[PDB]
Design a protein around this motif. Structure first.
Motif, short mmCIF file in Angstrom:
data_model
loop_
_atom_site.label_atom_id
_atom_site.label_comp_id
_atom_site.label_asym_id
_atom_site.label_seq_id
_atom_site.Cartn_x
_atom_site.Cartn_y
_atom_site.Cartn_z
N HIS A 292 10.57 10.39 10.02
CA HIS A 292 11.78 10.04 9.24
C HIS A 292 11.57 8.69 8.58
O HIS A 292 11.73 8.53 7.37
N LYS A 293 11.15 7.72 9.38
CA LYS A 293 10.65 6.42 8.89
C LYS A 293 9.28 6.55 8.20
O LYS A 293 8.23 6.55 8.85
N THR A 294 9.28 6.60 6.86
CA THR A 294 8.08 6.80 6.07
C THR A 294 7.33 5.50 5.74
O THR A 294 6.39 5.52 4.91
N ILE A 295 7.76 4.38 6.32
CA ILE A 295 7.21 3.05 6.04
C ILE A 295 6.86 2.31 7.34
O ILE A 295 7.46 2.56 8.39
N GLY A 296 5.89 1.40 7.24
CA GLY A 296 5.45 0.60 8.37
C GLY A 296 4.77 -0.67 7.89
O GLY A 296 4.71 -0.93 6.68
N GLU A 297 4.26 -1.46 8.82
CA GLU A 297 3.69 -2.75 8.48
C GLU A 297 2.39 -2.95 9.26
O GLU A 297 2.30 -2.62 10.44
N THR A 298 1.40 -3.51 8.58
CA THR A 298 0.07 -3.70 9.17
C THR A 298 0.12 -4.91 10.12
O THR A 298 1.09 -5.65 10.11
N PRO A 299 -0.92 -5.11 10.96
CA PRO A 299 -0.91 -6.30 11.83
C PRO A 299 -0.94 -7.64 11.09
O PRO A 299 -0.50 -8.65 11.64
N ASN A 300 -1.47 -7.64 9.87
CA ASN A 300 -1.35 -8.77 8.96
C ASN A 300 -0.10 -8.77 8.06
O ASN A 300 -0.04 -9.54 7.10
N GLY A 301 0.89 -7.94 8.37
CA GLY A 301 2.16 -7.94 7.63
C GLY A 301 2.20 -7.22 6.29
O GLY A 301 3.24 -7.24 5.62
N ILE A 302 1.09 -6.59 5.89
CA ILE A 302 1.05 -5.78 4.67
C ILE A 302 1.85 -4.49 4.84
O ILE A 302 1.73 -3.79 5.85
N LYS A 303 2.65 -4.17 3.83
CA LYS A 303 3.53 -3.02 3.88
C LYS A 303 2.80 -1.73 3.42
O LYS A 303 2.15 -1.70 2.37
N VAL A 304 2.93 -0.67 4.23
CA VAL A 304 2.33 0.62 3.93
C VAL A 304 3.40 1.70 3.95
O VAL A 304 4.09 1.87 4.94
N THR A 305 3.54 2.42 2.85
CA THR A 305 4.50 3.52 2.77
C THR A 305 3.74 4.84 2.56
O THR A 305 2.84 4.92 1.70
N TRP A 306 4.10 5.86 3.34
CA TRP A 306 3.52 7.20 3.18
C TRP A 306 4.40 8.07 2.30
O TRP A 306 5.61 8.05 2.40
N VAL A 307 3.75 8.84 1.43
CA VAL A 307 4.42 9.74 0.48
C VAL A 307 3.60 11.03 0.42
O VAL A 307 2.40 11.02 0.71
N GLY A 308 4.24 12.12 0.02
CA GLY A 308 3.56 13.41 -0.04
C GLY A 308 2.83 13.68 -1.36
O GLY A 308 1.88 14.46 -1.39
N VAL B 177 0.82 -1.21 0.00
CA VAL B 177 0.00 0.00 0.00
C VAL B 177 0.86 1.26 0.00
O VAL B 177 1.89 1.35 0.67
N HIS B 178 0.40 2.25 -0.75
CA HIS B 178 1.01 3.57 -0.77
C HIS B 178 -0.06 4.61 -0.52
O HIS B 178 -0.98 4.73 -1.31
N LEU B 179 0.05 5.33 0.58
CA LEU B 179 -0.89 6.39 0.89
C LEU B 179 -0.26 7.71 0.53
O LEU B 179 0.85 8.00 0.97
N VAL B 180 -0.94 8.49 -0.31
CA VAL B 180 -0.48 9.83 -0.68
C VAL B 180 -1.23 10.82 0.18
O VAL B 180 -2.45 10.86 0.17
N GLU B 181 -0.50 11.63 0.93
CA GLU B 181 -1.11 12.46 1.97
C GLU B 181 -0.18 13.60 2.34
O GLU B 181 1.00 13.40 2.60
N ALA B 182 -0.74 14.80 2.38
CA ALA B 182 0.05 16.01 2.58
C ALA B 182 -0.01 16.53 4.01
O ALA B 182 0.87 17.28 4.43
N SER B 183 -1.04 16.14 4.75
CA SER B 183 -1.28 16.66 6.10
C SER B 183 -0.59 15.79 7.14
O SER B 183 -0.93 14.61 7.28
#
Ligand SMILES: Nc1ncnc2c1ncn2[C@@H]1O[C@H](CSCC[C@H](N)C(=O)O)[C@@H](O)[C@H]1O
Length: 400
Positions: free
Chosen positions: A143-159, A114-120
């Motif tokens: 600083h760490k723009t990435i994380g992992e869901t409880p089911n191990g799915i990868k989520v990265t935040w971007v502007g 997953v990639h979430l695009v978000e400015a706020s």
């Protein structure tokens, strides 16, 4: 009459130095300025609150969008690696429902990141608290723009959309995202026999009601000329249209990503299958108020012009097309929402909670609620027939 705000002095200063600004620049400032922007500054300090949107009405919404992601993944050919992008995720509630509900589809679930695009930053923080599994403390939040869901799915935040990887099949989700994008406003002048742009300037007249005021460009601006082939050629004097150029640029990025590496987008919003003449609204304390009434203090929304999006994509003349729009109610039913309604409801066996579930379903699909005002359009490959758009119209004139 009085008195002048800190943000209205900053915005009046832009007009002194650079001349009257565009409606686009004006909305860009009101929503996305640090430190005066409606998003990021105030109306948050937590999980927003005032987020009463389709995902927040019912998990039913998130689940149907999830079925769409899986069905679309299937029609694309079950790619081994698949990206899911959300533009403007809000609290992350939509994404949370999707990831919860699509877990049973093991093959699908193993291919997604997953990639979430978000400015706020505030909305970024709410999204992360939600959605992410925290294993150790000592996480640096920004600083760490990435994380992992409880089911191990990868989520990265971007502007911005531009930062999302390219050359991987991608689904794009944009839900009440386009109505918060800046627009330009254009007005026909018979005198110039051309389009002019409505701009925002100082107001230092005697009876100047709000400090700022709507003025009109003399000649045709850069933006008028840039988009002239999307504006109506036929123009009565004073005839006025809104165009979401920000959204058209985004639409083009998505169309090209799909052209290069495959995918599909789902854009859901309130809007029209025609050019929108006037829709820009400012709401505050549950009342409609003037756009130039303490800018920053009201939420600015627009009704989405789905028609220009569709044309703009098709005008790229590559492997991508745009199909729709269709009414939110018709889409959700065509995805099977009434089956899920009764499946979820059967499990509730609490009758007061059942009524809760149904009322949220009615809000989503009934024409006097969100059912017709809200509409769905897809950007996708010409070759892969979309899911949920059997009722979409054929626009024979625009297809060359
Ligand atoms: N230019 C921009 N780029 C990226 N994100 C933006 C943006 N303008 C607004 N946003 C984000 O888009 C969201 C609009 S509000 C909609 C939230 C969510 N889709 C819901 O249904 O509740 C917010 O999260 C806001 O921070």
């Amino acid at each position: 009459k009085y008195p002048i705000t800190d943000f209205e002095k900053y915005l009046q200063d832009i007009t002194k130095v650079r001349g009257p600004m565009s409606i686009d620049t004006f909305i860009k400032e009101v929503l996305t300025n640090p430190k005066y922007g409606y998003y990021m500054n105030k109306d948050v300090f937590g999980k927003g609150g005032d987020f009463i949107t389709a995902p927040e009405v019912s998990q039913l919404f998130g689940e149907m969008i999830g079925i769409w992601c899986v069905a679309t993944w299937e029609a694309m050919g079950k790619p081994k690696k698949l990206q899911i992008v959300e533009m403007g995720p809000g609290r992350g509630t939509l994404m949370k429902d999707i990831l919860r509900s699509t877990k049973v589809f093991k093959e699908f679930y193993d291919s997604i990141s997953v990639h979430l695009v978000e400015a706020s930053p505030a909305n970024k923080k709410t999204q992360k608290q939600n959605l992410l599994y925290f294993k150790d403390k000592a996480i640096n939040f920004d600083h760490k723009t990435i994380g992992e869901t409880p089911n191990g799915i990868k989520v990265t935040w971007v502007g911005k959309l531009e930062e999302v990887p390219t050359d991987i099949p991608t689904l794009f989700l944009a839900q009440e995202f386009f109505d918060a994008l800046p627009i330009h406003v254009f007005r026909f002048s018979r005198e110039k026999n051309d389009w002019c742009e409505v701009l925002v300037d100082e107001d230092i007249t005697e009876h100047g009601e709000y400090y700022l005021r709507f003025v009109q460009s003399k000649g045709p601006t850069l933006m008028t000329t840039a988009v002239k082939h999307l504006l109506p050629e036929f123009g009565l004097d004073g005839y006025q249209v809104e165009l979401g150029l920000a959204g058209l640029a985004i639409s083009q990025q998505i169309a090209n990503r799909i052209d290069k590496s495959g995918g599909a987008a789902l854009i859901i919003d309130y809007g029209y299958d025609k050019i929108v003449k006037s829709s820009l609204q400012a709401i505050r304390d549950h009342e409609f108020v003037d756009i130039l009434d303490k800018p920053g203090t009201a939420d600015l929304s627009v009704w989405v012009d789905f028609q220009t999006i569709r044309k703009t994509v098709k005008l790229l003349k590559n492997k991508s097309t745009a199909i729709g729009p269709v009414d939110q109610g018709i889409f959700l039913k065509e995805m099977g929402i009434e089956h899920r309604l009764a499946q979820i409801g059967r499990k509730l066996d609490s009758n007061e909670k059942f009524e809760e579930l149904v009322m949220g379903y009615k809000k989503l699909v009934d024409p006097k609620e969100m059912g017709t005002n809200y509409k769905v359009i897809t950007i996708c490959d010409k070759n892969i027939t979309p899911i949920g758009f059997s009722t979409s119209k054929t626009y024979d004139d625009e297809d060359l």
